[PDB]
Amino acid sequence: MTKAELRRRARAAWRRLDLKALSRAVGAALLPWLRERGFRHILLYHPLPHELNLLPLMEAYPARYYLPKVAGKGLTVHPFGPLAEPTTPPEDPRVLDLVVVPGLAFDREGYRLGHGQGFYDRFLKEVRAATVGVVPQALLFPALPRDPWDVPVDHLATEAGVEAVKRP
């Protein structure tokens, strides 16, 4: 089937769950991995609907944190900071050692059902960093329809903890 049909299914799943609680659970279950790896420069995201709030990570795991900003067809990286649009300077993405990627759903190969704009697809080609897709277990779907422009994450984090995506 189509990505549109899958997105409808993912939304039905998101509404049977408690987003605050799953946000807390996913954040908690990330912490051993973050500590083991010792990541220091992490890109999060500003939480939208059918998304986990993982901003409480910052207090739980002290690090330099960053947020993406849309600029053109691209994501740019700004430190977590004041807004009026961020006031912190733009920064080159190579400073990051971890990218945390939200999604409507992911498959176990690390592919995501996104917002359809290509931002993460373009952005994930410019980083050399560990990546992790964050999702409730219920939003781990069977293999998503695959396109040449799709870029997978290499780890997944659910309320059960962090797991590798098998190398393609």
Side-chain angles (χ1 to χ4, degrees):
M1 88 211 235
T2 64
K3 292 196 165 188
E5 285 164 333
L6 287 164
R7 287 196 292 278
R8 187 175 55 178
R9 174 172 305 148
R11 293 175 195 128
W14 280 99
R15 63 187 51 114
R16 54 223 35 167
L17 72 77
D18 181 336
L19 174 73
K20 203 177 147 55
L22 267 290
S23 289
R24 284 200 323 150
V26 176
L30 270 161
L31 197 53
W33 182 61
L34 296 178
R35 297 171 153 150
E36 259 208 286
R37 294 295 287 262
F39 297 123
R40 293 192 305 138
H41 297 92
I42 304 171
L43 189 72
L44 298 185
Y45 56 87
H46 194 46
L48 285 186
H50 292 175
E51 282 183 4
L52 303 172
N53 169 28
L54 301 184
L55 281 51
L57 261 182
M58 304 189 195
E59 57 157 348
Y61 185 67
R64 302 311 313 249
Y65 288 97
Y66 308 78
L67 290 175
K69 178 189 161 192
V70 183
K73 306 194 279 195
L75 292 186
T76 58
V77 167
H78 291 254
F80 182 70
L83 295 181
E85 209 222 34
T87 70
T88 43
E91 297 192 15
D92 196 86
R94 233 88 162 180
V95 301
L96 304 171
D97 56 12
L98 179 61
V99 179
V100 178
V101 187
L104 267 183
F106 284 85
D107 67 27
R108 295 176 182 78
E109 292 76 45
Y111 293 87
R112 91 187 251 279
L113 216 47
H115 292 301
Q117 311 296 315
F119 291 125
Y120 281 99
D121 293 327
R122 267 158 342 247
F123 185 72
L124 294 177
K125 293 237 160 81
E126 44 187 291
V127 303
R128 304 297 319 160
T131 55
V132 59
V134 289
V135 62
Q137 289 186 68
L139 280 306
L140 276 174
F141 279 8
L144 296 175
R146 193 87 61 92
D147 304 298
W149 56 89
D150 297 336
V151 179
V153 294
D154 75 341
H155 306 84
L156 292 159
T158 72
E159 66 266 37
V162 184
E163 70 190 338
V165 173
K166 300 205 177 159
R167 160 157 49 274

